[PDB]
Coordinates of N, CA, C and O in Angstrom, one line a residue:
X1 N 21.5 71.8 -55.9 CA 22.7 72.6 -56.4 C 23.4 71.8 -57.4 O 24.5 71.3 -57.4
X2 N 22.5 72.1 -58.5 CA 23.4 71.4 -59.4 C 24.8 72.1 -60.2 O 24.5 72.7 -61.3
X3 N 25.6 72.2 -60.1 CA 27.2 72.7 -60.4 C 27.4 72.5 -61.9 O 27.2 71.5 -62.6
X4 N 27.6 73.8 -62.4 CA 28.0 73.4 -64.1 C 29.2 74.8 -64.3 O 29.7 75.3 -65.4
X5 N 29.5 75.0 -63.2 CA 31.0 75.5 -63.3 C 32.6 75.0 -62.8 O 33.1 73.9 -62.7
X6 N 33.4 76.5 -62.5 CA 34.9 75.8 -62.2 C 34.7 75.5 -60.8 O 33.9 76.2 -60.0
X7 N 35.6 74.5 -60.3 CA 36.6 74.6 -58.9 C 37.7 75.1 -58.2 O 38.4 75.1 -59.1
X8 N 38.2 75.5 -57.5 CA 39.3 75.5 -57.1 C 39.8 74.6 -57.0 O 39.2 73.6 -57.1
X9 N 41.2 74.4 -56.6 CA 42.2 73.3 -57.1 C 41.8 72.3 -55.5 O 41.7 72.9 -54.4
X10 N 41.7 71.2 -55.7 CA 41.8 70.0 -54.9 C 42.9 70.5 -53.6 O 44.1 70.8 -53.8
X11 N 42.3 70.4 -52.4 CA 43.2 71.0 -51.6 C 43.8 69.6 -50.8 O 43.2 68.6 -50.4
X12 N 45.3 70.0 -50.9 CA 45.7 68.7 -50.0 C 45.4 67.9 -48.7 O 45.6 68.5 -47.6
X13 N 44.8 66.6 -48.8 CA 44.7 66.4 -47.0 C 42.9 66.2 -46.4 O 42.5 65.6 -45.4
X14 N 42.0 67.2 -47.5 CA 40.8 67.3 -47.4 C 40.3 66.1 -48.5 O 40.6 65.9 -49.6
X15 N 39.5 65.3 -47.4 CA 38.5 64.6 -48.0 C 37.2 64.4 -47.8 O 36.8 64.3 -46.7
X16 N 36.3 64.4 -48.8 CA 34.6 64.4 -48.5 C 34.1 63.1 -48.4 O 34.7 62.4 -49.2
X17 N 33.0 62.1 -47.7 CA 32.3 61.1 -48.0 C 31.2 61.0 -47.9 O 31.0 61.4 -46.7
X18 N 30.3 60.8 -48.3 CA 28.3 60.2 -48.6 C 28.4 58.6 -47.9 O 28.7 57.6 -48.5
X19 N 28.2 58.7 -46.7 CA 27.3 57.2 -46.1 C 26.2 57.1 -46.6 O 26.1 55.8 -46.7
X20 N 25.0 57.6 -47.1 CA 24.5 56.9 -47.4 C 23.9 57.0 -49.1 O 23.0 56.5 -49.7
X21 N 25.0 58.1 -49.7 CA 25.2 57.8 -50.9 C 26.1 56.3 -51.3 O 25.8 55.6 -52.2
X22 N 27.1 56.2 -50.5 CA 27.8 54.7 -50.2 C 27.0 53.6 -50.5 O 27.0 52.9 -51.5
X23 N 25.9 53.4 -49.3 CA 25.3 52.6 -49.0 C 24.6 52.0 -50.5 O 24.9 51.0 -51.2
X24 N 23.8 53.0 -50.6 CA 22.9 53.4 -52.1 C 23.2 52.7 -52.8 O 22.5 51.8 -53.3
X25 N 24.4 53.2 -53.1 CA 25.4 53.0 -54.5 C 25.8 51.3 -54.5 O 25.6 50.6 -55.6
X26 N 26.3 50.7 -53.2 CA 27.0 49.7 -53.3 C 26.3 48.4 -53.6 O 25.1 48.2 -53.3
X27 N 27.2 47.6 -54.0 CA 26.3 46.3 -54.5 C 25.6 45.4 -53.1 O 24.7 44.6 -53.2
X28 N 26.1 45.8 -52.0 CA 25.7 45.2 -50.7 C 24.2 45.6 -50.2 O 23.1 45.0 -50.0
X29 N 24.7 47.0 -50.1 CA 23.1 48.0 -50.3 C 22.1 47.6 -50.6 O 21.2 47.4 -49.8
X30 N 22.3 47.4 -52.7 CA 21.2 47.4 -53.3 C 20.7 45.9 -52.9 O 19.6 46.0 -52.4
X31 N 21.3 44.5 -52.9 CA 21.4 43.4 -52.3 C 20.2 43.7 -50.9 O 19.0 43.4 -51.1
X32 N 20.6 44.1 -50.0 CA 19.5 44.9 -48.6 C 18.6 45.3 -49.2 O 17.9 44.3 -48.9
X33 N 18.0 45.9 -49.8 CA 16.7 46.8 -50.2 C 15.8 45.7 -50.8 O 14.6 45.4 -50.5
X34 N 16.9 44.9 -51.9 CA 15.8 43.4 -52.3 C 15.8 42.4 -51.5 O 14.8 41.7 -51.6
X35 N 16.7 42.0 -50.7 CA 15.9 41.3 -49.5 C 14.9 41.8 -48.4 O 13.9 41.1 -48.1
X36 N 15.2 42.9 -48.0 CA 13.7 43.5 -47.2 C 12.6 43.8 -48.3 O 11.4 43.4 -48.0
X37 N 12.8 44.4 -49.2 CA 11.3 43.6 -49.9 C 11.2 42.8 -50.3 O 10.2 43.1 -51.0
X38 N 11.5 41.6 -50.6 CA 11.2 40.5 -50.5 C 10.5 40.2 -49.3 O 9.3 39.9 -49.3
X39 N 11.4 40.2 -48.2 CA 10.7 39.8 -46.6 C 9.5 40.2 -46.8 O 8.6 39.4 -46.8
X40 N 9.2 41.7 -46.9 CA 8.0 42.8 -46.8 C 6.9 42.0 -47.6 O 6.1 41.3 -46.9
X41 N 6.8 42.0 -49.1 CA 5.9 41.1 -49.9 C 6.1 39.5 -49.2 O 5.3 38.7 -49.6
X42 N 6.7 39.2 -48.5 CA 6.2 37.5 -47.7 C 4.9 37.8 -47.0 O 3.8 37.3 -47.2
X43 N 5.3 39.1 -45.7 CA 4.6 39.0 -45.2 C 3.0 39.5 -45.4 O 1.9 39.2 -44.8
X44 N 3.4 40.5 -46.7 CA 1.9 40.9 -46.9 C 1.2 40.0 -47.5 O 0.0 40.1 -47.6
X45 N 1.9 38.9 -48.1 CA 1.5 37.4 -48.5 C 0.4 36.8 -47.4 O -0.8 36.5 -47.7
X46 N 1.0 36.6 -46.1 CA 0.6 36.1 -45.8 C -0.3 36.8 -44.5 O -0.7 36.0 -43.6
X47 N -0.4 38.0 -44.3 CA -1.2 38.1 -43.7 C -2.7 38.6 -44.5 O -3.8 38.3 -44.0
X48 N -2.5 39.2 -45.8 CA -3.5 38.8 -46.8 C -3.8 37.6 -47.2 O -4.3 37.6 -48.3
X49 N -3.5 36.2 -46.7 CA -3.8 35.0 -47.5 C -4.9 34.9 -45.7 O -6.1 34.7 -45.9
X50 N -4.6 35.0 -44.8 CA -5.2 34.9 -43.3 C -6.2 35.6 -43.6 O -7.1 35.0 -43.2
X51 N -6.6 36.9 -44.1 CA -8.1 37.7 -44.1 C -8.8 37.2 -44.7 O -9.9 36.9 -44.3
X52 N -8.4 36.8 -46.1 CA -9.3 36.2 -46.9 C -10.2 34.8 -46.3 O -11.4 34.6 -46.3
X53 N -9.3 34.2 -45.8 CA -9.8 32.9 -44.7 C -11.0 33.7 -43.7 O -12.2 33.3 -43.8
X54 N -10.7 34.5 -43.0 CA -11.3 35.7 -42.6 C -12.4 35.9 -42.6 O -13.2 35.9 -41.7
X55 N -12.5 36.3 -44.0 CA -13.5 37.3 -44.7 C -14.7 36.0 -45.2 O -15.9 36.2 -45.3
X56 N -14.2 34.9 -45.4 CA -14.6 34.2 -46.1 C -15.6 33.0 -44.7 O -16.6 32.5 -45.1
X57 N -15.0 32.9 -43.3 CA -16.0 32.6 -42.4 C -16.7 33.5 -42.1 O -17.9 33.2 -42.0
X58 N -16.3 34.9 -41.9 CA -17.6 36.0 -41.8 C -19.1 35.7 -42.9 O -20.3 35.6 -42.7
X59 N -18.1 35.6 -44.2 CA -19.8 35.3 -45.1 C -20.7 34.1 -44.8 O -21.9 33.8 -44.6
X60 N -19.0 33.3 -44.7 CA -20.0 31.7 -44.0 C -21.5 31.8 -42.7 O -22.6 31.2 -42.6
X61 N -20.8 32.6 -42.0 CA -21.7 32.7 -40.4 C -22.9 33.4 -40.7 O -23.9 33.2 -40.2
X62 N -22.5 34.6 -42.0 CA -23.6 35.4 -42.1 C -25.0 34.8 -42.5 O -26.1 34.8 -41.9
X63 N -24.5 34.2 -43.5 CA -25.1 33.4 -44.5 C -26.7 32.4 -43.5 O -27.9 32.3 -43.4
X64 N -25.1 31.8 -43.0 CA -25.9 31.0 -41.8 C -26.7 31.7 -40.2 O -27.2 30.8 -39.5
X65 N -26.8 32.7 -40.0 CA -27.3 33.2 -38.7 C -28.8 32.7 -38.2 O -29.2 32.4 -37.1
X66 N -29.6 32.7 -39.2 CA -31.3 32.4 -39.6 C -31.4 30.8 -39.5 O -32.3 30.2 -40.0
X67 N -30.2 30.2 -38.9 CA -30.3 28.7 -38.9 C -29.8 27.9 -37.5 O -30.3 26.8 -37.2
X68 N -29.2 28.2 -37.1 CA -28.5 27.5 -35.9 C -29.0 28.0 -34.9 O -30.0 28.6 -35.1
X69 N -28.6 28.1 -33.7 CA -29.4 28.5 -32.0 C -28.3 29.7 -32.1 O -27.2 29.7 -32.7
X70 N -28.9 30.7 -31.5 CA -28.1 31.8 -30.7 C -27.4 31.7 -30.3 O -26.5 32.3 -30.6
X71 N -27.3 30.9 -29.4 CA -26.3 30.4 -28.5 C -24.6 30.1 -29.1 O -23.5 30.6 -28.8
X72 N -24.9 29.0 -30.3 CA -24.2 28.7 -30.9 C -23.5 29.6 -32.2 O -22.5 29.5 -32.8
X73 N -24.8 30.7 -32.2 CA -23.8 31.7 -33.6 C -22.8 32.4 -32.3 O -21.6 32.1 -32.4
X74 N -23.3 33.2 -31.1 CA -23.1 33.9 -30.0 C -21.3 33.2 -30.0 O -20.3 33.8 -30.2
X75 N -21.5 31.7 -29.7 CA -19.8 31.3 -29.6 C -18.8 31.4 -30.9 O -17.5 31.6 -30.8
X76 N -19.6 31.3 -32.1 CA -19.0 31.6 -33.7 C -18.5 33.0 -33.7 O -17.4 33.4 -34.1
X77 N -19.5 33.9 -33.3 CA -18.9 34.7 -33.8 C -17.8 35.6 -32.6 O -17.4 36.7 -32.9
X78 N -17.6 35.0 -31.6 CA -16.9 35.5 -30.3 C -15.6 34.7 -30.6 O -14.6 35.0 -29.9
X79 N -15.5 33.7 -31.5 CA -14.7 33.3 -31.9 C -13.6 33.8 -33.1 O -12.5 34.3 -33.0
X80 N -14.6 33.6 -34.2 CA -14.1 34.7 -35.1 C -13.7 36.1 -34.8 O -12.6 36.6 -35.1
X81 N -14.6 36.8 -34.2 CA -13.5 38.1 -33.4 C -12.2 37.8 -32.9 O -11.1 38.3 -33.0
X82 N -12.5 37.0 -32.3 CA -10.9 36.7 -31.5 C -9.6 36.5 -32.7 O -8.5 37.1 -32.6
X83 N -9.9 35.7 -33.7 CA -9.2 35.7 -34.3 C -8.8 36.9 -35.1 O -7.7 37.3 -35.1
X84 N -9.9 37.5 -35.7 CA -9.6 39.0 -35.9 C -8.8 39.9 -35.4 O -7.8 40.4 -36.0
X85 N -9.2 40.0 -33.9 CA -8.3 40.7 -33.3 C -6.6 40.6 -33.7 O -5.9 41.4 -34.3
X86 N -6.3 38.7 -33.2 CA -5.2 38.5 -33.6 C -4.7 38.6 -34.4 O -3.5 38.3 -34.4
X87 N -5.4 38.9 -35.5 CA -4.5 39.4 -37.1 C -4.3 40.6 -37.0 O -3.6 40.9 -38.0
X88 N -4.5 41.6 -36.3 CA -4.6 42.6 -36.0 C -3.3 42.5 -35.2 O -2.3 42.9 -35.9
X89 N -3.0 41.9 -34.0 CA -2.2 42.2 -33.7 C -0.9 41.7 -33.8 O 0.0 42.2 -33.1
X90 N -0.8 40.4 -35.1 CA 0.2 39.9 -35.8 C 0.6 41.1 -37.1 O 1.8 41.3 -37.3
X91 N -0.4 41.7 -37.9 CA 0.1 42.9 -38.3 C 1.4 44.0 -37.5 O 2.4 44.6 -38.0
X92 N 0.7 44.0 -36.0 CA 1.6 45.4 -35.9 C 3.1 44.3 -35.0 O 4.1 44.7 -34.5
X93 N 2.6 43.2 -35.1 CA 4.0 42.1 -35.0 C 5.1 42.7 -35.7 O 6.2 43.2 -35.5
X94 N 4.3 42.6 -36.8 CA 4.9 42.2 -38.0 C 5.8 43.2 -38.4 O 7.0 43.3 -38.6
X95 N 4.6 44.4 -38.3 CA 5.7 45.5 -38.7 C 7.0 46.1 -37.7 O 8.0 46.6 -38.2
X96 N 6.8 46.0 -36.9 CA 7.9 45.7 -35.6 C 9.0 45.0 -36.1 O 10.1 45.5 -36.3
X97 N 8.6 43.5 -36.3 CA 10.1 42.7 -36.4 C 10.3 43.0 -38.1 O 11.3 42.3 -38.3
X98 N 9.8 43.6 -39.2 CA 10.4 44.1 -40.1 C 11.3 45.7 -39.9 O 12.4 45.8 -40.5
X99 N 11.0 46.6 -39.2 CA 12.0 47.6 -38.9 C 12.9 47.3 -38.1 O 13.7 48.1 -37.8
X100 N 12.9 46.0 -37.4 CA 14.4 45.6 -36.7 C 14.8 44.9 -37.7 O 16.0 44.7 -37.6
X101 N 14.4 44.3 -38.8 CA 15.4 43.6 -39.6 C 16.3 44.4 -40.2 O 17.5 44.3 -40.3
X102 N 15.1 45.6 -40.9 CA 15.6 46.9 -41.6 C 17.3 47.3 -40.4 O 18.4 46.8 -40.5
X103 N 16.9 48.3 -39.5 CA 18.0 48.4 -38.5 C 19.0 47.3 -38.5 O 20.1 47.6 -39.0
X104 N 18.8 46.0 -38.0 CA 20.0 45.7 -38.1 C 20.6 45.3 -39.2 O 21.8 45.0 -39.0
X105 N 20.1 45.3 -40.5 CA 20.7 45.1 -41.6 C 21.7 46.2 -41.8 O 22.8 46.0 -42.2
X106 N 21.2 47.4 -41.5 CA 22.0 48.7 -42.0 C 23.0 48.7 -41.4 O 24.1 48.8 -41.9
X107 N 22.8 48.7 -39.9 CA 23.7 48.9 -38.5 C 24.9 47.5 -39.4 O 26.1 47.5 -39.5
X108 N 24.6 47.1 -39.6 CA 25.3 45.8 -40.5 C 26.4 45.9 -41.5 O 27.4 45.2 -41.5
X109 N 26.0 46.9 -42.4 CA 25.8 47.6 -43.5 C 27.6 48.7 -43.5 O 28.7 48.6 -44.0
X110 N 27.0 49.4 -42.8 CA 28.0 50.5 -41.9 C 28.8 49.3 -41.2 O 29.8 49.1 -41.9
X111 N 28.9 48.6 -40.3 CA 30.2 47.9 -40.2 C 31.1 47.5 -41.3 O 32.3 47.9 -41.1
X112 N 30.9 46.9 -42.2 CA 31.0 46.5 -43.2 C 32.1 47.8 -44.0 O 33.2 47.6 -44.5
X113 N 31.4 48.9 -43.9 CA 32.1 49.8 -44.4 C 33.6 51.0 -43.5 O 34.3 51.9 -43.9
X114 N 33.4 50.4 -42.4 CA 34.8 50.9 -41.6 C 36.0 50.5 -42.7 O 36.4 51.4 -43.5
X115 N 36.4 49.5 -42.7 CA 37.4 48.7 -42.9 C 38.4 49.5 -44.8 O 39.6 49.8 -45.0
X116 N 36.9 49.7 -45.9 CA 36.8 50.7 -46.9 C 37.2 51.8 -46.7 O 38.2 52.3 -47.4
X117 N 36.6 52.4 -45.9 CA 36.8 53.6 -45.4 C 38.1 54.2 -45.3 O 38.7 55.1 -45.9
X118 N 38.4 53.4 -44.5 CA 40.3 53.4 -43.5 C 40.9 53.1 -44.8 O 41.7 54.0 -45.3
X119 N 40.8 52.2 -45.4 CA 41.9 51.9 -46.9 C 41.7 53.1 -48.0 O 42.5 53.1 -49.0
X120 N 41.0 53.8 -48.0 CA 40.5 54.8 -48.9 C 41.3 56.0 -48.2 O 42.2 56.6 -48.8
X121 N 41.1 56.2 -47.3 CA 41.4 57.1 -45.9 C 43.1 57.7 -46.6 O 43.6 58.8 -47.0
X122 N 43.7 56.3 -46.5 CA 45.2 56.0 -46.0 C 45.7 56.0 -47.9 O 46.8 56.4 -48.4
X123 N 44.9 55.6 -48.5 CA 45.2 56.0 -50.0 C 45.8 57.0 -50.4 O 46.9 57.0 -51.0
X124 N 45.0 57.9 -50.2 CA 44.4 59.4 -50.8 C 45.1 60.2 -49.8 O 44.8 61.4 -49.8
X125 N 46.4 59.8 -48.4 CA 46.8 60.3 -47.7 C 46.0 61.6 -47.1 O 46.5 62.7 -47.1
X126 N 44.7 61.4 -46.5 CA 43.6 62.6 -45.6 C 44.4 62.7 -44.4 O 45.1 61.9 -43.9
X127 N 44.3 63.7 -44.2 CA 44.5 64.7 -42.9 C 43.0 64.8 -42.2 O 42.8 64.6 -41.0
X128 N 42.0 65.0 -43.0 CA 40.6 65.0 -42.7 C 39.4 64.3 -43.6 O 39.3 64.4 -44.9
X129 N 38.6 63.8 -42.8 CA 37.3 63.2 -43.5 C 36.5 63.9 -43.6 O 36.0 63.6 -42.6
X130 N 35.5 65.2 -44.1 CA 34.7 65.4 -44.2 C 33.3 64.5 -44.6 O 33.3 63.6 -45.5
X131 N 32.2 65.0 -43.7 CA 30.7 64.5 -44.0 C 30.1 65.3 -45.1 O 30.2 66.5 -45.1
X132 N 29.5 64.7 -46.0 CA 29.0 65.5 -47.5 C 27.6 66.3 -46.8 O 26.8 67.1 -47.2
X133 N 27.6 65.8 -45.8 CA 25.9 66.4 -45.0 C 26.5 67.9 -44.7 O 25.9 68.9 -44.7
X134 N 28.0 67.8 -44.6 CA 28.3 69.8 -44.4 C 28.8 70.2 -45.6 O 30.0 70.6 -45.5
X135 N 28.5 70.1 -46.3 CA 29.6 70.5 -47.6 C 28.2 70.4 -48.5 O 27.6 69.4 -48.7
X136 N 28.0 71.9 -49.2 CA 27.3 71.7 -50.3 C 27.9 71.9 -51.9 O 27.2 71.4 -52.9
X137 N 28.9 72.5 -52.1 CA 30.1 72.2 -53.1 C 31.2 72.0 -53.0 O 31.7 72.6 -52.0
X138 N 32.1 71.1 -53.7 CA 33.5 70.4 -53.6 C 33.8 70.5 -55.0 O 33.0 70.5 -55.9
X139 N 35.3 70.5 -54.9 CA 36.1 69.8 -56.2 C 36.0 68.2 -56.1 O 36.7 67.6 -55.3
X140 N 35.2 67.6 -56.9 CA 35.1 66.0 -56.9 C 36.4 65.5 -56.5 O 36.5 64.7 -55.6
X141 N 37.5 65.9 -57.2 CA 38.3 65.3 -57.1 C 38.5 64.7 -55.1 O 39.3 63.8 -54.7
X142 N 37.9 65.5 -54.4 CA 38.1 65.8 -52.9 C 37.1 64.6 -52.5 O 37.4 64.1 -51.3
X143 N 36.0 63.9 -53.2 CA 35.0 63.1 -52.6 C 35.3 61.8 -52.7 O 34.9 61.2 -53.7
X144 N 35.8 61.3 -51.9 CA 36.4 59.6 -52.0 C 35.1 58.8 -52.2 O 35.6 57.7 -52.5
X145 N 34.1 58.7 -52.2 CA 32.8 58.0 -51.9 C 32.9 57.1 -52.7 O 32.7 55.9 -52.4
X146 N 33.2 57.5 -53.8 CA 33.2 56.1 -54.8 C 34.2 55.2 -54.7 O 33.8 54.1 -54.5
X147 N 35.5 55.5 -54.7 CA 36.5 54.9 -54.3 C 36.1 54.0 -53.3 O 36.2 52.8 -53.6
X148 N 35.7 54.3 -52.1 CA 34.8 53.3 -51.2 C 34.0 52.3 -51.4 O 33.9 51.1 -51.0
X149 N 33.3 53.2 -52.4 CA 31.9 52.1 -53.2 C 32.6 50.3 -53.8 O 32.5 49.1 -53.6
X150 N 33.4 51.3 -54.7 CA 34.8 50.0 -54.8 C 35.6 49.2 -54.0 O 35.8 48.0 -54.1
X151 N 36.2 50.1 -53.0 CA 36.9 49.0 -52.2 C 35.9 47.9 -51.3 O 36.1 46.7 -51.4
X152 N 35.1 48.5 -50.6 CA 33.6 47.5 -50.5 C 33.2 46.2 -51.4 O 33.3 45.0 -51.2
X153 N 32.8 47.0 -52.3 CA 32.5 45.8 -53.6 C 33.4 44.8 -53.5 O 33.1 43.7 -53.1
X154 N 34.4 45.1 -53.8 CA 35.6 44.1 -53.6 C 35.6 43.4 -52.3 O 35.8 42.2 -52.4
X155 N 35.5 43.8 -51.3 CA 35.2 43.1 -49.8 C 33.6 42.3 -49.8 O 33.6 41.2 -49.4
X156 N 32.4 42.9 -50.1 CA 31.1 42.1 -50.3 C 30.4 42.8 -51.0 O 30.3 44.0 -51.1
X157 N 29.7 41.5 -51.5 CA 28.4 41.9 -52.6 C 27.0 41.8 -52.0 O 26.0 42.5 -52.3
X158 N 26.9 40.6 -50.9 CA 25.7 40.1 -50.7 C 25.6 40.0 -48.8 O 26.5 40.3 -48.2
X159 N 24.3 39.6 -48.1 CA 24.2 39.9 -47.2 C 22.7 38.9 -47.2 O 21.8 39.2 -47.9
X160 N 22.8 37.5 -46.2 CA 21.5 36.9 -46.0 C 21.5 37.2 -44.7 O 22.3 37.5 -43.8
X161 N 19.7 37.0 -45.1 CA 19.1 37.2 -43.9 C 17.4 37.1 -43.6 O 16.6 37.2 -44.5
X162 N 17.2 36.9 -42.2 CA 15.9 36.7 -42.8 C 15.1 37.0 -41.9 O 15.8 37.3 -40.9
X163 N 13.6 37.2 -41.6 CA 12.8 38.3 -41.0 C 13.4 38.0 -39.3 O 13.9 36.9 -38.9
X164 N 13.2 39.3 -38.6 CA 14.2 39.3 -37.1 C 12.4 38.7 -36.3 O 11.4 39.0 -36.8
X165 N 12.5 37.8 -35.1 CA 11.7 37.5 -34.5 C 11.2 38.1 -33.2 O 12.2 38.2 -32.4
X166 N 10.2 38.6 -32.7 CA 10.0 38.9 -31.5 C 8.4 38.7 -30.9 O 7.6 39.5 -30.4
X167 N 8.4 37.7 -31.2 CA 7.0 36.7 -30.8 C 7.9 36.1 -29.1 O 7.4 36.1 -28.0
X168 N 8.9 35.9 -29.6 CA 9.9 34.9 -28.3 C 9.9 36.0 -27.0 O 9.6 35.5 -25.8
X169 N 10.2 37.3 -27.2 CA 10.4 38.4 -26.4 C 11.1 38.1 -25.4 O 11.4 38.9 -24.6

């Protein structure tokens, strides 16, 4: 719904906000998105640097099968499966403790933004907050969201952090 007409007049008391046009927008945000990929490309680092190792005793054993006892490929390669497996299930580790990082970064994210909120709130003297998720046209002048975007910025820019663990359980 893109809007290329008039408004009605800004009504007093009513105010609109976007969480996660907020989020989007803000320098904290964007800061989140490049550290989880970041994280994301470590790990595909390094569970692609592990197959290759992988992939690369599979040829070894192959190569060699027409040479050693049965016995002894029989333990090689019951071995290498195992490890297989376990890349396998360091993968779905993986992706596990990357969407709790994700979550609690955001859950993080939104605290961060109470404090914005309330000073924006008390600014602009609201009677009410509206969610932009029910409102599909407004008079801008009604959408504090940016105002927030700013008071934020001004409170934080940045946010470390680093992959959540759950090997420990």
């Amino acid at each position: 719904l893109y809007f290329q007409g008039t408004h009605g007049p800004a009504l007093p008391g009513v105010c609109i906000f976007s969480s996660p046009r907020a989020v989007g927008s803000s320098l904290v945000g964007k800061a989140v998105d490049a550290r989880l990929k970041t994280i994301i490309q470590q790990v595909n680092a390094e569970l692609t640097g592990e197959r290759t190792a992988l992939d690369n005793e599979a040829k070894a054993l192959d190569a060699k099968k027409t040479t050693i006892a049965q016995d002894a490929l029989e333990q090689q390669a019951a071995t290498l499966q195992a490890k297989a497996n376990a890349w396998q299930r360091k993968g779905q580790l993986r992706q596990k403790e990357v969407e709790a990082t994700e979550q609690k970064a955001l859950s993080r994210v939104y605290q961060e933004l109470n404090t914005p909120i309330q000073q924006v709130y008390q600014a602009q003297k609201c009677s009410v907050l509206l969610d932009r998720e029910a409102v599909m046209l407004a008079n801008p002048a009604m959408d504090i969201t940016d105002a927030v975007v700013a008071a934020l910025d001004a409170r934080i820019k940045t946010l470390t952090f680093d992959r959540e663990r759950l090997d420990q359980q």
